[PDB]
Design a binder for this molecule. Structure first.
Ligand SMILES: COc1ccc(COc2cnc(COc3nc(-c4cnn(C)c4)cnc3N)cc2OC)cc1
Length: 293
């Protein structure tokens, strides 16, 4: 979403991004949903620098039709309007003319943050590369906050902030984005009939209201994901009538194993029942950037 709400089909696709599709050489498939997939590829002569580099290319699986074609184009038009930041999955180019709609973006080698933390935790238990510590977890949260702070500054709402959507690139730089149609089949469970119920705020569940403050609620759950080393939110609890009453009546998860008091306290602030009383993304940055340094 973009507040002004703006119809994404009405937004102009900028031809500056256009890239010759024959200058793309595809490799291994990184991910694939129901009607989308993300294959890695080498882009020859990209931008003013004409840099030969490896890029992630998202595209529709052949079994995807009119609604998907406009859906993917809507994501391209949003990424073009947003601009560029260190902590967001940046648009590098796209291919609209003479074939299917392709969307070229930065390539983050370590993958998504949820799978990263789960693999790294198992690596640290191995003994009984380079082990994770508290400063790393505080760093990731600090970067994801900066990206969301940049998104909010352009009057843009994410509607699905999560560790699955956060990508880690070279030198451990967390970039927030949205896989979208190139979802993981392993992540189909979290989307209840489809929306990510466990990450959404109450107003988004009941009133269907989506604001910058509702993304902060999700960022609170994203912190719980990070400082629990990739546990599922509300672990063991099933999504049903009983869950909705708990979330509305003000139920909160217990302090995760690796969360400092001040870090867990910030999650509770993000889980304020009143949307307006939650922390701004700018407030979360200045704090976490300090706790990092
Ligand atoms: C909120 O406004 C926005 C902002 C950014 C976006 C970008 O949307 C995306 C596009 N494309 C990808 C996928 O590309 C990549 N995939 C991998 C990958 C996957 N598995 N493995 C092993 C590696 C790594 N790096 C990649 N760049 C991921 C997006 O969001 C995360 C959409 C909406």
């Amino acid at each position: 979403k973009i507040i002004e709400f703006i119809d994404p089909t009405q937004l102009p696709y900028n031809e500056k991004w256009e890239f010759p599709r024959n200058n793309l050489q595809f490799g291994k498939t990184l991910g694939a949903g129901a009607f989308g997939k993300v294959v890695e590829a080498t882009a020859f002569g990209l931008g003013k620098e004409d840099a030969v580099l490896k890029v992630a290319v998202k595209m529709l699986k052949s079994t995807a039709h009119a609604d998907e074609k406009e859906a993917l184009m809507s994501e391209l038009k949003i990424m073009s309007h947003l601009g560029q930041h260190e902590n967001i999955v940046n648009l590098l180019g796209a291919c609209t003319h003479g074939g299917p709609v392709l969307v070229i973006t930065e390539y983050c080698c370590y993958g998504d943050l949820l799978n990263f933390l789960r693999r790294k935790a198992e690596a640290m238990l191995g003994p009984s590369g380079r082990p994770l510590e508290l400063r790393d977890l505080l760093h990731f949260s600090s970067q994801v906050a900066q990206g969301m702070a940049f998104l909010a500054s352009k009057n843009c709402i994410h509607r699905d902030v999560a560790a699955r959507n956060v990508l880690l690139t070279n030198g451990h730089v967390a970039k927030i984005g949205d896989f979208g149609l190139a979802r993981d089949i392993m992540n189909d469970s979290n989307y209840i009939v489809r929306l990510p119920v466990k990450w959404m705020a109450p107003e988004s569940i009941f009133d269907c209201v989506y604001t910058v403050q509702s993304d902060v609620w999700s960022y609170g759950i994203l912190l719980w994901e990070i400082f629990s080393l990739g546990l599922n939110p509300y672990p063991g609890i099933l999504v049903n009538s009983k869950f909705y009453k708990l979330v509305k009546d003000g139920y909160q998860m217990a302090q995760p194993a690796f969360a400092p008091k001040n870090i867990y306290s910030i999650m509770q602030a993000c889980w304020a029942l009143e949307p307006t009383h939650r922390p701004t993304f700018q407030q979360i940055c200045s704090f976490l950037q300090e706790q990092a340094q």
